[PDB]
Design an enzyme around this catalytic site. Sequence first.
Site, PDB file in Angstrom:
ATOM      1  N   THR A   1       1.035  44.415  85.422  1.00 47.04           N
ATOM      2  CA  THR A   1       0.186  45.568  85.647  1.00 47.04           C
ATOM      3  C   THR A   1       1.006  46.852  85.505  1.00 47.04           C
ATOM      4  O   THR A   1       0.520  47.859  84.986  1.00 47.04           O
ATOM      5  CB  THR A   1      -0.440  45.484  87.037  1.00 47.04           C
ATOM      6  OG1 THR A   1      -1.294  44.335  87.086  1.00 47.04           O
ATOM      7  CG2 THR A   1      -1.261  46.729  87.332  1.00 47.04           C
ATOM      8  N   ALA A   2       2.256  46.803  85.948  1.00 45.54           N
ATOM      9  CA  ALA A   2       3.132  47.963  85.861  1.00 45.54           C
ATOM     10  C   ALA A   2       3.356  48.376  84.409  1.00 45.54           C
ATOM     11  O   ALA A   2       3.554  49.556  84.115  1.00 45.54           O
ATOM     12  CB  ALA A   2       4.474  47.669  86.531  1.00 45.54           C
TER      13      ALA A   2
ATOM     14  N   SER B   1      -0.597  38.952  87.402  1.00 47.63           N
ATOM     15  CA  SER B   1      -0.780  40.398  87.324  1.00 47.63           C
ATOM     16  C   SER B   1      -2.223  40.758  86.989  1.00 47.63           C
ATOM     17  O   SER B   1      -2.874  40.049  86.227  1.00 47.63           O
ATOM     18  CB  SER B   1       0.145  40.975  86.248  1.00 47.63           C
ATOM     19  OG  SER B   1       1.504  40.767  86.576  1.00 47.63           O
TER      20      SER B   1
ATOM     21  N   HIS C   1       9.321  45.082  91.659  1.00 46.79           N
ATOM     22  CA  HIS C   1       9.622  44.376  92.903  1.00 46.79           C
ATOM     23  C   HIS C   1      10.252  45.305  93.937  1.00 46.79           C
ATOM     24  O   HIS C   1       9.934  46.489  93.970  1.00 46.79           O
ATOM     25  CB  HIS C   1      10.519  43.172  92.622  1.00 46.79           C
ATOM     26  CG  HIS C   1       9.874  42.142  91.745  1.00 46.79           C
ATOM     27  ND1 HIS C   1       8.771  41.413  92.140  1.00 46.79           N
ATOM     28  CD2 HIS C   1      10.145  41.754  90.476  1.00 46.79           C
ATOM     29  CE1 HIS C   1       8.392  40.622  91.151  1.00 46.79           C
ATOM     30  NE2 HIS C   1       9.209  40.810  90.129  1.00 46.79           N
TER      31      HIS C   1
END
Length: 264
Positions: free
Chosen positions: A108-109, A59, A146
């Site tokens: 990252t989310a 990430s 995802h």
Amino acid sequence: HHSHKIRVAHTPDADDAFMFYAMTHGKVDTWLEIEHVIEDIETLNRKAFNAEYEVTAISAHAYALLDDKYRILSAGASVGDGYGPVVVAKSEISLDGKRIAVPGRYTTANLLLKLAVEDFEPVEMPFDRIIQAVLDEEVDAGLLIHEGQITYADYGLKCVLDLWDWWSEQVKLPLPLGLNAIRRDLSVEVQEEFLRAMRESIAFAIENPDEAIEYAMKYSRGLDRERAKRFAMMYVNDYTYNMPESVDAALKKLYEMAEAKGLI
């Protein structure tokens, strides 16, 4: 050709299998003796703190905590552009003070969520359980990094926070999500060679979307062939073939924002 034996780690996801199809099927000519290791993205973000593999997906968020031993590879990155991770719920809510299931602390989310909502309860949890937890009201909301981002509607769920809309309001550049990272102790020889093989594998996938997607189906998670191709093509394109200047700028920005709030 020294140190020609290396470990390349990536994820059990369609978009990933798609990108690596050519390489995983001896369709890429290289003098490198590659050993593939498939593990969940959060598992790789954590194992990356020990510099376990020579080359590993990771990430963008996590990368900021290991740019001392690893550097970003020009190919392999996944970048959202008009789309990306989202937070979903059974109905419209504000999210403030709410309990939100998250796939991994270092994704990252998560960094994005922590920047958009500066006060909520993150519930660490494997990705393969986020949807169920929301539908069964185990939590108030769930972060989907995802294929959930394009399938949540099938469960009667709706987006309450579109991370891309939020990011677009912060800066006008693509959204860096996943990156391909290569250990800094590898020779220039191995660095260039793997980059070459990586690019070829990606280009092969685009020119043979049906073939590459066929094998990738093993990680489709119920998605039909069309939906899977669409997902893979969303995160395996030009940006993945070669990170452009705009994406380099976006990471720089992303990190600055993270530093400014003490998230790193």
